[PDB]
């Protein structure tokens, strides 16, 4: 039974940084593509970052450089470090594992199929 629990969302001002956490239960996160998605207000859910079993990371065009994803295997937890946040980063950030893919590789960033999903965490970035 795969459970993902996000935390660390909050209000921050543009320029600032935040760190999100996603604690995973029922899977070893090293063996899967783990992912961050987000849904901005009124918008469809979008891919943000992902990390394959080799710990290689891929990032969406709009966040590359600024955002970084990593992994802590002893805690079975996945992080997103968001640096130089902008008003457009305001969204519910959701963590996911590509549970139903055989392989440790990642689908495309915007590939919301094959996943178990957490519940989301709110990030608000004021001007």
Residue numbers in the entry: 1 to 82, 82A, 82B, 82C, 83 to 100, 100A, 100B, 100C, ...
Lines quoted from the article behind this entry:
Overall, we could select Env-specific nanobodies from 25 families, of which six nanobodies showed potent neutralization of primary heterologous Tier 2 HIV-1 strains from several subtypes in a standardized pseudovirus-based in vitro neutralization assay.
Both, VHH-5 and VHH-28, have a long CDR3 region that folds over to partially mask the face of the VH domain that would be involved in contacts with the VL domain in a typical Fab fragment. The CDR3 of VHH-28 (19 residues long; H93-H102) is two amino acids shorter than that of VHH-5 (21 residues). 3D reconstructions of ZM197M-VHH A6, 5, and 28, each resolved at ~25 Å, were used to dock in a high resolution model of BG505 SOSIP.664-PGV04 complex, which confirmed the presence of extra density at the CD4bs.
